[PDB]
Amino acid sequence: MRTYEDTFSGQRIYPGKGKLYVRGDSKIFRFQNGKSESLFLQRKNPRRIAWTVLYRRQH
């Protein structure tokens, strides 16, 4: 079996959860749950989201 890391929010992903979204220019994104996916589609920036793993590491 295998596990993946959320692209937008860095949360862990086990098999069966979440979905996989392919952008037009052949780039593959994974979202652990609806909250990550919805925020990404609104062109929000992960850097300014307080609960993200990247935001914590950046600060």
């Binding site: 086990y14 652990q32 609806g34």
Partner: peptide, 11 residues
Amino acid sequence: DTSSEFGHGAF
């Protein structure tokens, strides 16, 4: 699987 079914369980 042994994650929580009360929500979007992650661990």
